Amino acid sequence: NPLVYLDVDANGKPLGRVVLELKADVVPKTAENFRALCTGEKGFGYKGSTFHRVIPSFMCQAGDFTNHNGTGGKSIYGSRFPDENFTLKHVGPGVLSMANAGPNTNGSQFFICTIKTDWLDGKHVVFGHVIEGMDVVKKIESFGSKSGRTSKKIVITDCGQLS
């Protein structure tokens, strides 16, 4: 399975590195989309974009590199893509899953759970998990709010593939 990284800053100050394992063994199409958006190999992707909606005791959401507000993004497949399967579940903190706007609306937006979000099982495609840097995710979460607006600008300053 690929390993990818997100290096995250808050108001220009480094928070550290999040390392994610992508479950290409279970959801290959969804994993590949995220992998390629981390490397930027298609000329666009996550580098320089933000965590735009962060809600404590819920999740940290990112990946809207077109509109920066939860309305946009772009997949590697030319259009929004179907829910590949719902095999993997939102079992606890560190689960990596696709944001969406209803069924079969996967793009580039994603979230990292900070609790078990089991009511999302069967609705959002889980495709990986944090293997290093959960403390970085907890720091991101600490800048969230009930509305999801962040109290500092949380930027993916670099991202890419490790292996």
From Swiss-Prot:
The modification N6-succinyllysine is found at residues 23, 42, 131, 146. Residues 5-161 form the PPIase cyclophilin-type domain. One of its GO terms (biological process) is regulation of proton-transporting ATPase activity, rotational mechanism. Inhibited by cyclosporin A (CsA). Is displaced by CsA from the mPTP leading to a lower open probability of the mPTP. It catalyses: [protein]-peptidylproline (omega=180) = [protein]-peptidylproline (omega=0). GO terms for molecular function: cyclosporin A binding; peptidyl-prolyl cis-trans isomerase activity. One of its GO terms (cellular component) is membrane. Acetylated at Lys-123; deacetylated at Lys-123 by SIRT3. Its main location: mitochondrion. It is found in: Mitochondrion matrix. It comes from the Eukaryota. The modification S-nitrosocysteine is found at residue 159. Its EC number is 5.2.1.8. Belongs to the cyclophilin-type PPIase family. PPIase that catalyzes the cis-trans isomerization of proline imidic peptide bonds in oligopeptides and may therefore assist protein folding. Involved in regulation of the mitochondrial permeability transition pore (mPTP). It is proposed that its association with the mPTP is masking a binding site for inhibiting inorganic phosphate (Pi) and promotes the open probability of the mPTP leading to apoptosis or necrosis; the requirement of the PPIase activity for this function is debated. In cooperation with mitochondrial p53/TP53 is involved in activating oxidative stress-induced necrosis. This is Peptidyl-prolyl cis-trans isomerase F, mitochondrial. The chain holds residues 45 to 207 of 207 of the full protein.
